[PDB]
Design a protein around this ligand. Structure first.
Ligand SMILES: NC(=O)C1=CN([C@@H]2O[C@H](COP(=O)(O)OP(=O)(O)OC[C@H]3O[C@@H](n4cnc5c(N)ncnc54)[C@H](OP(=O)(O)O)[C@@H]3O)[C@@H](O)[C@H]2O)C=CC1
Ligand SMILES: NC(=O)C1=CN([C@@H]2O[C@H](COP(=O)(O)OP(=O)(O)OC[C@H]3O[C@@H](n4cnc5c(N)ncnc54)[C@H](OP(=O)(O)O)[C@@H]3O)[C@@H](O)[C@H]2O)C=CC1
Ligand SMILES: O=C(O)CCC(=O)C(=O)O
Ligand SMILES: O=C(O)CCC(=O)C(=O)O
Ligand SMILES: [Ca+2]
Ligand SMILES: [Ca+2]
Ligand code: NA
Ligand code: NA
Lengths: 407, 411
């Protein structure tokens, strides 16, 4: 009945797919009508269309400014045999992120009754990681035997091509890889980082390994520092916050013993990994939001940070009972819809967005939660069946709670 | 007085250099005589020898089979300016690890009175991280403007040349790099991992991102699997343990919520970073061992995993009282000497090494400790001067306790 606007939706795989459908059936569709542009990133369909469906979904997001994505399978060899795939398709996440660009901001979803693994974290940690380039765009290969691996730069302006020696393999083979990043993208990431910091009133840290990657990482470090000095510094001081670069070793240690309450700017690989470390440290991988904010200020893709949860899905196929946390998948929808509402100045969509979220927190805070969350309070071995609901029960319960509150 | 043998010693920088001298002077030299082959990896001395001293140290370690290393500054632009360096020298750790090769095993040092940051870790987590290649021997450069970055392989015979497009820079510039690893080194790293799992009777996890780096990381995953199946699987099933690959994201989450009690094989970068996170989670960076175990099975370099503690050094330079935890540095010596002893079948030195370890734990467990550890107990905002000992005080107390312990043993 509520008029949503246009949303790009990406369907995914395995356990998350199951959950994705439950969320549309019970939390979204009964209450909200949309111009839904649906792309199926299920791995069967991606194989069928030779991954073209993925490039299509990314373009759709540019047009419509808003995307909600279910977790997908990125195939290695086992996966190729499993689904009889054409080939080892690349990560859709990496494909879409590289086309859209921007910064991925992740943040735990906090309930008051859910204890943390790490004692100190009483304030949020917001991770914003660079979406573009590096490992997702890397070229890696097997080195078959002895020989020489080199990397070369040929300037477009006709001046001398430059060649560096990567390694001389003199005994057997191995592996080698090239990767890159772009100044403009890195600039965008710096501004997005400083702006999020000002926005929250929290200090900003950048982590790199510039002592080791002196040129590659030093470039991130320099770009951040240049832009800070020229463009944000006084505004930081005015708010009594700060920016500082830290080596990645020190940062992860610092973060661990911290009391939280900062923005953590990461390179792509570190953002990907440290975001799992942090979600789990607050409680669970089901309790983290993830939004890609594009450089335009306008476009957004929301998702759950975690994967398809194949381990739980395997039980589901064997007919056994499961308890998977859908909270993150649900916030992919509320964050996306929130943004849609703010774009269109849709007063009611915004209301629904925020309702489903407080409904989610309120349900867990009343004592209805999936197995992972009960494990947080009790310790896994002390958890009994009466302590949690299963995937379907819990979805139903949120469903009836949404009913009551919207009514 | 104990006859030590030949040890290759590598001297360092900043706060650890100070602590290094205190350890030698108060814990080692009073009791042990050594054929010390001393290499000064202080940054001034590396700059004066164009870093040749670091390669010499490494070569000395092949020859003598044991090395003990102090934390070193790895310079970036700020350090060049600070020390007026000729160049931004490469990490001595990378240099040494790539010359020797092998697997770096890192583990927390645990005291019964010290709370953890992470609740569940009632057993230890042992990380074995590949010492060779990757980021540490990378070639990286700034791309100054539009143009094409390519990476090429040419076989030794010259019979063929393979060119891969890395990126087409048309817009402006950026950065690019290449990195590499070798199969032999990866096979040695698999072996040490499975052996360490068997040794401890714990399960082994390997982490990669093979879904994203399909050839590079998939090479690691495959070598480990093939080697598991053919050579260690019977044995693993016998002690009722197991081996699995996990994706690095899943693995860090799994470690976080776990009970501990596993071996975690890591790629170079991940090992380097997660070992800090792990040490901190058990309570302190001062409380972790690190030994490079070479594939020859005979050669070892022991070190402190943390850095030079530059921030504590600044205070020291101002005359301000400091409290830096020396435990990891002391254990560089104790692990090195324990291995020298094992090599030489030397029971006096073996006994000494282990005696210095117990003394370290006993002193802390009796409530004498540096500030980081007192913060573990009280919470940083709650700790007062009376709660901890300063750097020299704590060293002097261990010195006393070591004297007692060795005396009681002589009796
Ligand atoms: N599209 C995407 O954004 C992502 C996709 N992937 C893909 O997903 C697939 C599986 O990835 P994988 O590394 O196995 O791990 P997943 O992140 O899917 O899950 C791994 C483990 O994390 C815990 N976990 C994750 N989500 C939940 C949840 N919602 N509720 C409770 N526990 C959860 C579970 O622990 P436990 O088993 O102990 O209960 C689970 O087994 C792979 O194909 C991978 O490529 C991976 C990451 C992100
Ligand atoms: N040689 C080596 O193996 C390594 C060398 N390095 C080099 O060390 C230098 C400094 O690196 P950086 O990352 O800043 O810092 P370090 O790793 O030396 O330490 C940074 C912070 O960690 C805490 N810490 C580390 N060790 C101790 C200790 N033993 N006792 C108490 N606290 C400790 C301190 O926290 P707090 O300030 O909060 O009290 C300290 O400020 C750099 O030049 C780097 O290149 C870095 C890593 C390894
Ligand atoms: O795309 C993938 O295969 C993994 C993505 C991921 O883990 C993430 O985006 O955090
Ligand atoms: O060599 C460096 O600069 C840092 C090394 C390091 O952090 C480590 O060995 O854990
Ligand atoms: Ca991840
Ligand atoms: Ca480290
Ligand atoms: Na499971
Ligand atoms: Na300090």
């Amino acid at each position: 009945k509520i008029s949503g606007g246009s949303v790009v939706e990406m369907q995914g795989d395995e356990m998350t797919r199951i959950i994705w459908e439950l969320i549309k059936e019970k939390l979204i569709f009964p209450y909200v009508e949309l111009d839904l542009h649906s792309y199926d990133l299920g791995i069967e369909n991606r194989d069928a269309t030779n991954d073209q469906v993925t490039k299509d979904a990314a373009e759709a997001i540019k047009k419509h400014n808003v995307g909600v994505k279910c977790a997908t399978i990125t195939p290695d060899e086992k996966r190729v045999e499993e689904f009889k795939l054409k080939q080892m398709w690349k990560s859709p996440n990496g494909t879409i992120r590289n086309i859209l660009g921007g910064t991925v901001f992740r943040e735990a979803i906090i309930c008051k009754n859910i204890p943390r693994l790490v004692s100190g974290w009483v304030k949020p940690i917001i991770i914003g990681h660079h979406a573009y380039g590096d490992q997702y765009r890397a070229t890696d290969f097997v080195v078959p035997g002895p020989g020489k691996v080199e990397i070369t730069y040929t300037p477009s302006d006709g001046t001398q091509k430059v060649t560096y020696l990567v390694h001389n393999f003199e005994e057997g083979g191995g592996v080698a890889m090239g990767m890159y990043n772009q100044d403009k993208s890195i600039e965008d990431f710096a501004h997005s980082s400083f702006q999020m910091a000002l926005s929250k009133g929290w200090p900003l840290y950048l982590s790199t390994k510039n002592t080791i990657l002196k040129k590659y990482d030093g470039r991130f470090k320099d770009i951040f520092q240049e832009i800070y000095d020229k463009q944000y510094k006084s505004q930081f001081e005015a708010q009594k916050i700060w920016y500082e670069h830290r080596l990645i070793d020190d940062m992860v240690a610092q973060a661990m013993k911290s009391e939280g309450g900062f923005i953590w700017a990461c390179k792509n690989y570190d953002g990907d990994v440290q975001s799992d470390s942090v979600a789990q440290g607050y409680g669970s991988l089901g309790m983290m939001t993830s939004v890609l904010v594009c450089p335009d200020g306008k476009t957004v893709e929301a998702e759950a940070a975690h994967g398809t949860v194949t381990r739980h899905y395997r039980m589901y196929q064997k007919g056994q009972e499961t308890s998977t946390n859908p909270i993150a998948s649900i916030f992919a929808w509320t964050r996306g819809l929130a943004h849609r509402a703010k774009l269109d100045n849709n007063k009611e969509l915004a209301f629904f967005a925020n309702a489903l979220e407080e409904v989610s927190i309120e349900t867990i805070e009343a004592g209805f939660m999936t197995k992972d969350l009960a494990a947080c309070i009790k310790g896994l071995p002390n958890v009994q069946r009466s302590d949690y609901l299963n995937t379907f029960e819990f979805m139903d319960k949120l469903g009836e709670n949404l009913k009551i509150k919207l009514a």
